[PDB]
Design a protein around this ligand. Structure first.
Ligand SMILES: [Cl-]
Ligand SMILES: [Cl-]
Ligand SMILES: [Cl-]
Ligand SMILES: [Cl-]
Ligand SMILES: [Cl-]
Lengths: 311, 311, 311, 311, 311
C-alpha cells in the first residue's frame, strides 16, 4: 500500500478529531496524565472510489491491512499509544472514515507558581511525517473534537477540550511535519486547602505569638521552639498535598515567610530576655509590647505583597 | 465477517451478563478497582442456523475468528480488558452463546464525605458501537448477572451486584452507541477505626484539657503545645488510613475542630496567665473553672452538630 | 480440535499437579503472592493412540496447537497466568503428559489477628469448565505435587505444599465446573519482633511510670507527655512492620492498651498535683504510692487476658 | 535476509542519527532517564538497486520484513527499546534511509558530589555486532543528530545533545562490535534550594546559638535539644529533595557539620553549667562569651573550606 | 524439529556462557536484581552438518524456527527472560553457535547480618529439562563467561562473575534436569555510613550522658527523654538506608543496645533524684559519678563483644 496520488501537486489533508472518554492519573510530580480517547481520521483516496449503484452498497468497510492509512503519532507521549481500530468506512468518492480507541500516558508541563489557585493547559500534540510521493497535512474537524460528560479528574474542574485549528508545519530531518495542538483546560479545586492546610498552619504560628504576653524565658523558649517543631511536623503531615518545585511557588513563599517569622520571634524572645537580665526591663517591655502589633501587621502586609506579586 | 443482516429494519439485541469471580485492589486515592469476571454475550445470527436433524448435533462450537462477534468494550477502564474466550456455542435457530473470562482495572468515582461510615456504588459501563449495515443494542440477561460468594474486598461489606436493565442509547461520532450500567454496592467496615483512630485522638485532646486544673503557666504551655505535637504526630501515624479528598469529609471536619480546640485552649492558657500576672486572679480562676465544663460541653455539642450535618 | 469423545457417558478426568519453583512477593496489604511453578496435566485421548511397533517410537511429541488440551484456569489470580509449554508427550494408548512453566499473582486472604505469631494457608484454586460434548473433572496426581527445596519467602517458614484431593464440582452459568484447592502453609518468623518492636515500646511506657516516684508536676508532665510523643514517633518508625487491618489484631490491642495507659498516667499525674495544690498531700502520696504497683500489675493482668483471648 | 555483500573486502558503514523528541523521568536514585527519540539509519544494499525508468518511481518504500536491516541495539538500556518504524526509503543506487521512533529507559551513572550545583553527562551507547559474511561499522551523520527545542527535564537546564564521531570498535565473544557514544549534557536548577533547604536549616542552627546569651541551664537544654529535634524533623521534611548516595556529597558534608555543631553546642552548654555549679562563674562566662563569636566564625570558615574542597 | 540423535546412548552437551552487559536495580527488600546479558549456547547436531566443498560457505546461518534449539530456562527468575536472538551459526560438523541478548529480574537471597560491611553472592541458575529421545546436560565455556568493565551497581564493588563448572544433575517430575550456578560477587561501599548513620547517632546518645554532670531533675528528664525522641526521629530519617530483616543484624543489635542505654540512663536519672529527695545525696552523687565512667565503658565493651560476635 502506497499513499493516494495527488491530482496536481497539492498535499493530502488528514482531518483529525480526539474525543476524550476517560481522563485519569494526573501526576503533579511526573507532569503526566493518562488518557483513554477516540481518534478519528479522514482523508480521500480516489483509488478506493466506487459506483454505489453497481456495488449495491452505500459504504464499504475495510481492514487496516487492506488499505493505506496515514502514520499519525503523538509527540508528547511516553511510549506509543495502545490503539484498537473500531471502524474503517469508505464512501463512493473514496473518502475514508477511520476510528480507533486509544490509551496513552501524556507528558504535559505544569506551572505550580499559583498553587493551589492554579489552572493548567494540558497538551496532546498530533503529528504526521510527509512521504517522498506527497506531503501530508493535518486538519481539525471540530464536530469530532469533544469529551465525555462523565470525564473527571479528582481535585480539578475540567474547563474545556479544544484544538488549535492552525497546524504547526515545519521541516525536520529533511522532511515536512504537520503538528496539531489539542488543549485540555483544568483549574484546581482549592476549597479543602483553607481548613486542611492554611488554617492549622496559621494557628500554630499564632500560638508562638503568645510569647509577646509572657516574661518567662523558659515558657517563651518552649512556646517558640515547640511550635517550630509542631510547624515542621504539620508540614510533614501535609507534604503529600504541597508540590516539589525547582522554582518558587506562592504557597512555597508563604511557608518560607512562616520560617522567617519563627526566627524573628526567637530573636525577640532572646532580646527581651537579655535586656531583662542586663537590668533594662523598660526596653524589654517596649519591644515585647511593639511585637504584639508588629508581628501580625508585618505578616498581614507581607502576605498582601506576596499575593500581589503572584496574582 | 460482516454483521448478521436485519429481517426488516430492527436493531440487533446483544444479551449481556457479568458474573464477578474476583474483586480486589480498591484504590481509595486512584478511585480504581480491579475486577476478574465472566462476560456472557448472546445474539441471533441466522447465517449460522442449522437443521439439528441433517447435522446430527444439538450445538455447534466455533473459534472467535470463524464467526462474527459484536465489538463489546467497557467505557470506564484504564486500558482494554484482558479477555480469554472460554466458549462459543450456536443453537439450531442460530443463537450464539459467547463466554469469556476477563480482568480489568475499572475507574469509578468515590464519595468520602461520610468516611468511615461511607457506602459506595461501583460502576462497570458496557458499550457497543453500531455499524453501517445494522444498529446494535445491549440487553441484560438477569439470570447471567451474579457474583461468586467468595468475592471479598478487604475493609468492605459487598452488598449487591446488579444492572440497570434499560440501556443508554445515544449518538457518538456520527454513529449509535448502546451503554449498560452494572452496579457493585459496597459499604465500609468501620470497627477498627474507633480504637485505632478516634479513641487515641480523643485521649490526646483530653490530656490538653488538664491545663484547666493547673495554674503553672510553664506546665500548661507544656501540656497544650506538647499534646498539639503529639496530635500532629498521631495524624502522621494514621495518615495512611484517612483519605486525600479535595472537599470536606466527616472525619476531616472533626480533625479541623480538634485543631481549633488546641488554639482556643492556648488562648485560655494565655489569658489565665495574663490575668494572674496583671494582678486579677479572681477572673483568671473563673475562666479556668468555666473552661473545665465549657470545653467538653462545646466539643460534645459541635460533634452532634457535625454528625447531624453529615448524616 | 474437539474434546476426546466418551466411550459411554463418563466425564473426562484431568490429572493435575503443581510444583513450586519460586515463591516471592507476599504482600501483606494486597493479600497477594507471586508464584513461579510447573503445571502438569494428564488425560487419555484415544484418537491419539498409536502402534509403537509400526511407529518405531515409544512416545510422540506434539505442539499445543496440534492436539486438544483442556482449558485449565486459576480462580484466584489477578490476570491469566504467563505460561510456557515445556513438553507434550503421548504414549501408545493416547495418554497425554502435558507440562508448562507458569508465573501468576495469586489473591489469597490473610488473617492478621495473631500477628506476629500468625500462620497462613495460601490457596491456589485450579478450575475447568465442562463442554457441551462432555463433562470435565479435575484430579490430583500427588507424585507431581511438590515444591523446590530452595523456595523461600523472607520472614516466613514454608511448612507444606499440598492439595485437597476431592474436587469441588458445582454448576455455574448453566455448566459444570470442577475446582481444586492447592494449599501452601506458611508460619511467621517472629524473633526480630521482640528486640525490634516490643522491647523498645515497653521501655518508653516504663519511662512514663517514673512519674510515680516524682512530685514535680512540671517534670511529670514532661515525663508522661514527652514519652507519649516518643511512643507515637516509635510507632511511625515501626509502622512498615505492623499491618493495616480493618478488624482487631493482637498486636493492635496491645498498642490500644498502651494508649489507654498514657491517658490513665496523665489522670494520676493531674490528680496527684490537684490534691497537693488543694492542700491534701497525704491522699496525693497514697495514690502515687499505689500507682507504683497498680500500673505494672494491671498492665501484666490485662496482657495475660489479651494473650488468652487471642490464643 | 542476509547482509549486503562487499564489493571488495570493505566493512559496511551504518550512518546513525538520534533526534531527541521527549526527555523525561530522570530518576536520581535509579540513575535512569526515559527517552522518546528518532533513530535514523543509512547504509548501501545494492541488492535493492533499481532503475527508476523500469520501476516508474524515483524512490522505493519497503516494509522492515521485506529487506535486510542492521541489528542496532543500545548498550545501556533496561530492556530493548520500544521501536516503531516510521519510514524505509531506497534510492536507485541501493542507499537505504531508515527511520524509527523509539522509547527507552537508559542507565547512565550520576555524580552527586556537587549537588545541588551538579552538572551531568547522560550516555546513550549505540552498538552493532558484525556478522560472518562481513564487518559492520557505525558512523555519525551530524545533520541527523539533534533535539526538539521543547525538550524539558524538570529541574535541569538541557545544555547539549552530541555524539563522539569516532566509534569504539572492539572484539567481543569472537566477533567485532562497533559502539557509538551519544551525550546529553544537563545542569541542575539550584534556585529553590536556598529558600527551601538551606535557609530554614540555618535558622534552626542559629536558634541553638541563642544559648550563648543565656545562663538558665533548663532554658539552654531546651534550646539545644529542641532545635536538634527540629533539625532532624526538618531533614525528614526535605529528605525527598536530598539524594541517597553511597559516598560523600557537598550538601551531605554541610549536614554532617551541622550535626557536629549541635554536639559541640551541647558540650559548651554542659561545660558552662558545670563551671557555674562548681563555683567558677568567671570561666563559664568567658567560654559563653567566646562561643558567641567562635561558633559563627568556625562555621563560616568550615563552610568556605567545604566549598573549596568540593569546587 | 526433534533433538539431535545420540551416536551411542550419550547425553547432549550444551556449552553455556553468560556475558554481563548491564547490572542494575538491586532491591535490598525484594532480594531481586535486574540483569542485561548475552547468553551463548553451543551443541552438536550432525543432521545440520555439511560438506564445505559441496556447499560453498563455511558457516551456515539459520533462523531460530528453522533448527532445533535446546529449551534453556532460568530457575530463579520472576517471569521468563526477554530474549532477542543475535546470531545462530552452524559449522560444517554441525556445531551450533547460538547467541541471544536477554534482560531478566533474578531472585537471589541476601544476608544482612554484617550490614553495612556485608558481601553478597548473586546467583543466576541455568536449567535444561531432558527429553524422551535424549538426555541434555549443561556445560560451561569459560572463555564465553565474562562481564563488561562498565558494569556498575551503585553502592557496591563488583568483585567477580564466575560459574560453578560442575552442573547439578537431578530428577524432577519423572525427567532429568541439568542446573548451572553462575555467581556474581559484590561487596558493599560502607564509607558514607560513618558520617551519615553512626556518628550522628552516637552524638545523640552522648548528649544523654551529660545528665551525669547535672543534678536538676527537670533538666535531666529533658536531656534523656528529648534525646530519646531525637534518636527515634533520627532513625525515621535514616530508615530508608537500614534493612527490614526478620533476623538479628549487626546494625540492628547496636540500635537495640542504644534503646537499652536510654532506659538504663532513665533509671539512673530517676534513682539519683529519689535518693536526693529521700535525703541521701551522698549515694545519689556516687551513682552519678560512677555512671560518668560506667556508661561509656559498658557501651565500648558491649560494642567489642557485638563486633566480635558478628565478625
Ligand atoms: Cl503515539
Ligand atoms: Cl475493554
Ligand atoms: Cl490463569
Ligand atoms: Cl535496544
Ligand atoms: Cl527464562
Amino acid at each position: 500500500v502506497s499513499p493516494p496520488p495527488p491530482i496536481a501537486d497539492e498535499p493530502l489533508t488528514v482531518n483529525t478529531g480526539i474525543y476524550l472518554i476517560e481522563c485519569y492519573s494526573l501526576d503533579d510530580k511526573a507532569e503526566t496524565f493518562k488518557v483513554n480517547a477516540f481518534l478519528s481520521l479522514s482523508w480521500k483516496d480516489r483509488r478506493l472510489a466506487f459506483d454505489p449503484v453497481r456495488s449495491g452498497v452505500r459504504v464499504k468497510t475495510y481492514e487496516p491491512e487492506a488499505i493505506w492509512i496515514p502514520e499519525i503519532r503523538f509527540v508528547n507521549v511516553e511510549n506509543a499509544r495502545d490503539a484498537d481500530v473500531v471502524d474503517i468506512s469508505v464512501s463512493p468518492d473514496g473518502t475514508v472514515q477511520y476510528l480507533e480507541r486509544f490509551s496513552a500516558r501524556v507528558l504535559s508541563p505544569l506551572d505550580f507558581r499559583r498553587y493551589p489557585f492554579d489552572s493548567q493547559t494540558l497538551h496532546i500534540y498530533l503529528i504526521v511525517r510527509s512521504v517522498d510521493t506527497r506531503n501530508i497535512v493535518l486538519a481539525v474537524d471540530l464536530e469530532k473534537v469533544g469529551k465525555n460528560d462523565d470525564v473527571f479528574l479528582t481535585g480539578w474542574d475540567i474547563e474545556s477540550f479544544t484544538a488549535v485549528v492552525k497546524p504547526a508545519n515545519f521541516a525536520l530531518e529533511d522532511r515536512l511535519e504537520s503538528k496539531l495542538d489539542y488543549q485540555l483546560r483544568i483549574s484546581r479545586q482549592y476549597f479543602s486547602y483553607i481548613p486542611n492546610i492554611i488554617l492549622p498552619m496559621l494557628f500554630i504560628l499564632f500560638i508562638s505569638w503568645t510569647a509577646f504576653w509572657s516574661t518567662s524565658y523558659e515558657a517563651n523558649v518552649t512556646l517558640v521552639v515547640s511550635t517550630l517543631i509542631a510547624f515542621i511536623a504539620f508540614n510533614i503531615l501535609v507534604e503529600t498535598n504541597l508540590p516539589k518545585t525547582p522554582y518558587m511557588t506562592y504557597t512555597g513563599a508563604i511557608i518560607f515567610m512562616i520560617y522567617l517569622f519563627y526566627f524573628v520571634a526567637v530573636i525577640e524572645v532572646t532580646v527581651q530576655h537579655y535586656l531583662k537580665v542586663e537590668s533594662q526591663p523598660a526596653r524589654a517591655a517596649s519591644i515585647t509590647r511593639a511585637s504584639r502589633i508588629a508581628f501580625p501587621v508585618v505578616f498581614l502586609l507581607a502576605n498582601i505583597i506576596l499575593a500581589f506579586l503572584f496574582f
